[PDB]
Amino acid sequence: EWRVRAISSTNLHLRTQHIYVNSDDVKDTGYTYILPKNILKKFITISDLRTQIAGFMYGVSPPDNPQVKEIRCIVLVPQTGSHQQVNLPTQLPDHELLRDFEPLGWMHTQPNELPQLSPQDVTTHAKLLTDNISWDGEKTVMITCSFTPGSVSLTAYKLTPSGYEWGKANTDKGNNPKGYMPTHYEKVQMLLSDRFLGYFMVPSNGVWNYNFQGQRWSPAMKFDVCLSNPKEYYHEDHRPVHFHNFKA
């Protein structure tokens, strides 16, 4: 029951008329995170409705405010999606400009409601934190957007020390754990910007989603970035296997 899912990708631009910051929060203690409307609107249209996709983001402080954080670049990465998890290599994106940023974002797309997070998210962040000694979990936060009907919600989260220790402690499929829990989770302050543009880094070969190319995908999988615009999901270069059976 595939082909309509390709067709459904058409309408993703419509959801961009109804983006919302899910602003039910009070913790002004959150190092308030600022995301720009341009890259978000693109990240909507390049998504795929019936699967998660994800990326990493890199930040600048405004020079006049150290604790406000502006998200300034998204790195899309080689990835294989899933309906309600995402597969990301242990390989870390790196570039001069990224190292010249302050490096703090990761975000994923949610098909639907999200009354709570996924443990795959936390374990990803915990694993990510476990690799990224630079990152520090008190600095670094996790973000979700949801394909609500005709709309998008924006919501953002932090992982507590009890969060990290849980992911550090955990190594499981973890469908109904203990410690997958609010002391382990945190909600943090984040904002949307019309005030400036950001930009995308992408893989050196462009092809970020794999899925049917998951045979090509690996958790090890060395890759690099290039500073190019993102190809959309169902772009030909992502989907070429459909053209290669019908060669004759």
Added chain:
Amino acid sequence: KMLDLNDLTFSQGSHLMSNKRCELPDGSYRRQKKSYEEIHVPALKPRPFAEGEKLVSVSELPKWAQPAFDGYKSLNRIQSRLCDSALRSKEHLLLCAPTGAGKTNVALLTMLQEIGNHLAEDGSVKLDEFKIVYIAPMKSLVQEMVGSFSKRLAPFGITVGEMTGDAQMSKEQFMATQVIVCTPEKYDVVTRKGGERAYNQMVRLLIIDEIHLLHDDRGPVLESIVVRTIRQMEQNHDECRLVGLSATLPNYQDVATFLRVKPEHLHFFDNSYRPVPLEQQYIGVTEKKALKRFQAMNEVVYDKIMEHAGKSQVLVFVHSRKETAKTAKAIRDACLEKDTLSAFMREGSASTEILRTEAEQAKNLDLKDLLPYGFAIHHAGMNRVDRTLVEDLFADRHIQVLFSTATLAWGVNLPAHTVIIKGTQIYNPEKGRWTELGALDIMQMLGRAGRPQYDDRGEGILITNHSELQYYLSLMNQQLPVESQMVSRLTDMLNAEVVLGTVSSVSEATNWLGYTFLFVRMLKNPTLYGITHEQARADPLLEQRRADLIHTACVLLDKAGLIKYDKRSGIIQATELGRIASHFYCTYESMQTYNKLLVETCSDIDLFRIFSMSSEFKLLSVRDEEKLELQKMAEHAPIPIKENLDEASAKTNVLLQAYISQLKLEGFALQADMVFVAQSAGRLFRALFEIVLWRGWAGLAQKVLTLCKMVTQRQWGSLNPLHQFKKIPSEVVRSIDKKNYSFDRLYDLDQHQLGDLIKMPKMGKPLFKFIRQFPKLEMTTLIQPITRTTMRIELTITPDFKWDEKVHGSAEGFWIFIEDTDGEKILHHEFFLLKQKFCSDEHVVKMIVPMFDPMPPLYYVRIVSDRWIGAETVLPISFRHLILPEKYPPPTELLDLQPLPISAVTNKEFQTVFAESGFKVFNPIQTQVFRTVFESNENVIVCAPNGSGKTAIAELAVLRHFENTPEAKAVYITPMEDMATKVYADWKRRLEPAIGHTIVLLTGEQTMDLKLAQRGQLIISTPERWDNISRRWKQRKSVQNVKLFIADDLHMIGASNGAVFEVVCSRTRYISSQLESAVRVVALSSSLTNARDLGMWLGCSASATFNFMPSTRPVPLDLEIKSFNLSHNASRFAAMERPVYQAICRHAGKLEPKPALVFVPVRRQTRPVAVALLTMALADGAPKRFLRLAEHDDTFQALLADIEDESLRESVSCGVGFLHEGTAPKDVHIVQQLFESNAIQVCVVPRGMCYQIEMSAYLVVVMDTQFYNGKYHVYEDYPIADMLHMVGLANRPILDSDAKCVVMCQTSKRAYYKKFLCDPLPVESHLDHCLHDHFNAEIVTKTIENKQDAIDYLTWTLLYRRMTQNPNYYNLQGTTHRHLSDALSELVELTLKDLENSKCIAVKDEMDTVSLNLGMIASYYYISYQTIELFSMSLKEKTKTRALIEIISASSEFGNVPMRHKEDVILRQLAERLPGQLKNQKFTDPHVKVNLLIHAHLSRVKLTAELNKDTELIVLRACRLVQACVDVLSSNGWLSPAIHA
């Protein structure tokens, strides 16, 4: 009134039988049989020869014409009769003759008549003075005619070229071809494209083959061509002979009237003139049951073969490739069933042995099976070798019965005794259904019946339905009238006239429509066109009927958005969509659909959907028998379809994907449909690409552009580009695909690694060659911010591939796109054409992009190949280090001050200077600044728009200075010599008597100019001339005695030569400081953004810094910018011609014509444009509309008689002047006098004379904004300062209350000019590029003795100020004093190191600078250091006179001699005439030009006025170079070379 065009359209097309009865020839008889009925028409006997009618021998033709008839003894009967009309008359010719009667040789006779008009005295043909166009109905026939004429025209050196829908001739190929053979549609598209307008004027002969296509639905294409030609001939008076070739059909007298053929040239030859008399048998199947009807046809075919078996060869035509083998075998089996096969082949014949032997070599198995039996097949699916072999075997009479497709009748002249047409129904994919065979096919099939000289008579058997028998009878018995189908295409045809601009009103449309053949037919048969006899009597001219038709079409075209139609005035204006639509032959309904459905968010699925929704496919229906086959295809479709599979739109989409996927189709009709869809896809997707490009949707444009390649390459974009190289086996590339090896990495692999990767070492070297031949381009960018809102990007393109004419052709096209950070909006787009001649040179393209707030982080520069898949390169331009320039200070407000009268100047002598200049009261701008300039001695800068009388401000400073200090010297510097001449001549006339002091203009001669500066109190000079003198200021007290320095048009510092201007201005203040002598600086300029920065650099007070807005002109200026979407300038010129004339009617008005000035890019353009305007005035019936004085005015007649140029004298007699650099000053003065007196309304002036002419006009017209720079081989844009100068001439404050300006430029430049013409101009320094020569001069004078001394001087320059305002322009990384100081230190080191490397100076102790002899020579003679180094490197102990000319010609001082377009050809002709010149010289290099011109001067060869003017400049420059060589050689101690110098 709105009419229904569908009801008036003949849905039957070619089957329209307008004759109600058919009369049979004498002896015709009917035979009714059991299953079929035969109607026999006997073969007509040839008419006897008339008294005196004899065959004209080829020897009777002129000897120069005889080579075209080599191998021919005499002309035929028809050709003999037309010899006078064809060879001796230039009048239009219509030949009505039976098919096969030798029309092709009659066409050749007409060609010779034109060749005779262009035959030179030596017997050569002036191949460049004329062109011949041959219109043929089919591509196969085009190929046949090209081959024939190639043999027949070879003795004349005539080049024959094919120009078809698929075979597009390049313009260079077009130039080399004199006779072009083409299709109607291709010639229409060619004429629609406008590119060949300059070529259409050279077309002197048009031959229209099978013009009776007028009865077919394609007939309107021929009408368009003829009407366009007639309207062009009548309007332009360019004679082109029309030659119509037609069948023997009624209404030929109307066609002659339509073709303007005089009755003397109307030739009708009945069917008795057919070379072989044809007996005709018409078989009308009466069976009502379709199956029994089909069965009866099979019976007839076998029966007639047996009737002719062994008696005569039979050629059986069928409509399908599969039908050839199936029918042939079925009849063969029927021949086997009745044991009649032996009648075809006599047992033991050599032909049986031949056919069996050839069958063994035949690759086609069905042909191989049939060939032993004497049967063969011929169809387009067979290979060319087997087809040619079958053709030969039938020509040799080996094949007795041949089954073939229509292509043989159209592609091979293979006549046969007997022709049998099995069935007359053919599947029409355009109509989606089975339709009757076209008349042309029947006539071509019947044209092959009867072999001349071998058969006494031919027999033609036509098998058809009993209902259709009368139609084919009417066709062959001269009874089928040719009717017009124009109604089906009237909208599209009318659109073409609007796009060409030949029709702009309902009156013009009614006139244009009066030339159509439809109009002749409507007049001749109103009842057929839905016009009642009463209606035709009330409107005998059908004016209302035509206007109602036109009105309906205009509303439809307006409703489609192709035109703007004012229903009241009837005015029609073309839109951009109409142009695109016309250029790609798309219907208005499809464009209207596209206009409705196309959005920026369109996906790939929507693009296919929108394409499938095209109205061209409206007649495609879904067949029940094909849904199941479509079902299999739908499962294999790689792109999802949103529409239901039952919809006709979906079917079209499926077919396209299969073709791109190269899928094999089973249904023949489906396969036919696929080709039809595929053939249309190429032009339609190309049109869509232009639409999205026009709207600027970057991401969509890249997609559509990729799809165009997919259609061309028949492959999906995901496949490796190597698949495009059809010479590489697909299996090899698939082995790479199976390995998932990236294409980019293939460039790094060697041929062995590549061969090993594919496990085929033999293919490694060929692939590597193909790999290194694949188009790849490298990009480097120079980023230059101009303003806080605008940035210049200079893109240098380096080709990194090996050119191959068989792969890349003569030129390859590339699209350069600058996309925003998101890739959504096209910020800039350009078409780059890499030519084979320049495939080794790097191309630098300068472009300017707008900047938005908030600042984007980066932009993307994307270059995309126009044809090659995957040949693209993307370069992100990061703004992380972009330091935006400071916000400019607000402009000076124009105070509403009371106008100062001329009496305000206290000196009565000074009042006369302005009274003589026509001043009564000072303008508001002058009034506000008068007090600061005339009463105060402060430094002042006045930036004001052109036409505000800025020149008077300099005069006031001069008048006041000598009034107060008559003994003190004043210097006025202007960058243009022509302006200096104007100012000097006018001031010498007006100011010198009022001031009583000698005014001098410097000439450039160092010794004489020094005397002039001493003698003259007021010195007018150019910066360059003044720089040479000011160098020795320390010794020249007269320079020290200069107290006033006026720098006019200071904005020219931003031009190429501004570096000298900045230095001259900078030194003036330094000298002013060192002498304790304040030199008052008065700066006059156009409105500037950074006017205060220059004022501060000049020491002007803030109160003395006047910067008025461009809108504050005393005369309001109306600026209209019209954009032309033509990248080819020569084509663009012809597109601008008529809008200019239209602008005169619209802007300069009828009844009260006002003076209009038209600027053209070149002298060569002046005269053609003037003639075109007169031609349009003549076409309007008012040739002298532009003249305002009486023709018999004695002063006008006296002035006319004083004009030396007869063509100018003639043009002026109608009120239109034209000027050029070769016009005598007296004639120029007369034209100026006539224009100022308003005697003549229009004057044509080249861009080079804008500073030379003094005329001011109400309307200024800038015809194009580009000139050809032959050094870079690129057409360069006009400098904005020059543009402002031309616009500045739109100023007549005493005669006109307002001014109009129409700037015609390329669409890509509209935003550029729109910005800088409305807003003030930012001026930046270019001194950094010329520091060496300036640095050397001050070191020679010991002004700079150390590196710090150079730095200190630099602090006085304007550069130092601007470096702080726009660091990134100057590659500075910061605005701090350290970064400024550090960057300055590096620049000094680099400049001085270069001077040290050139041995011009010597640096002692790495700090102190010592001038060397080379520096002294360069500084003394004012020669560039680059030339002095070259002389040091090029001069040798044995250099001789010839080598000296070469070395001197290579000097940088000659690197600025202008190279004009096609000037290399004239230089080539000169080099062939001069002794000892090398034939392999680069005739496009100015150094070669100077070398050739030097030898021509020494040989006293008479040169053109342009080259003479060039020669004068060259010789003057050479004198310094020769003198400079003497000093260089003396420093080296070589006696003999110095003597040679």
